[PDB]
Amino acid sequence: SYSSYGQS
Amino acid sequence: SYSSYGQS
Amino acid sequence: SYSSYGQS
Amino acid sequence: SYSSYGQS
Amino acid sequence: SYSSYGQS
Amino acid sequence: SYSSYGQS
Amino acid sequence: SYSSYGQS
Amino acid sequence: SYSSYGQS
Amino acid sequence: SYSSYGQS
Amino acid sequence: SYSSYGQS
């Protein structure tokens, strides 16, 4: 949880 | 949960 | 839950 | 729940 | 529930 | 939008 | 949006 | 967005 | 966003 | 973002 994987 | 995977 | 997967 | 998958 | 899948 | 505030 | 505040 | 504040 | 503050 | 502050 609390994670980023895409394009931000 | 609390995660990002797309384009933002 | 509480996640983003699309284009925003 | 509480998630986004489309175009917003 | 509480989710978006379409074009908004 | 897409939020909960009551008792469910 | 896409958030919870109550009792679930 | 995409956050929790209540009792779940 | 993508954060937790309550009781889960 | 992507952080926890409550009881989990």
Token pair belonging to G6: 């109550």
Report the half-sphere exposure of D6 (CA within 13 A, side-chain side): 8
3-state secondary structure labels for all residues of chain I: CCCECCEC
Q: How far apart are CA B3 and CA J3, in angstroms?
A: 10
Specify the experimental method.
X-ray
Contacts of I4 in chain H (CB under 8 A): 3-4
Sign of CA dihedral I3, F4, H8, C4: negative
Residues paired with A4 in a beta bridge: B4
CA distances from I6 to C2, E5, J3 (A): 14, 27, 12
Resolution in angstrom units: 1.1
Search chain D and give the residue with CA nearest H4: D2
Distance CA J5, CA J8 (A): 9
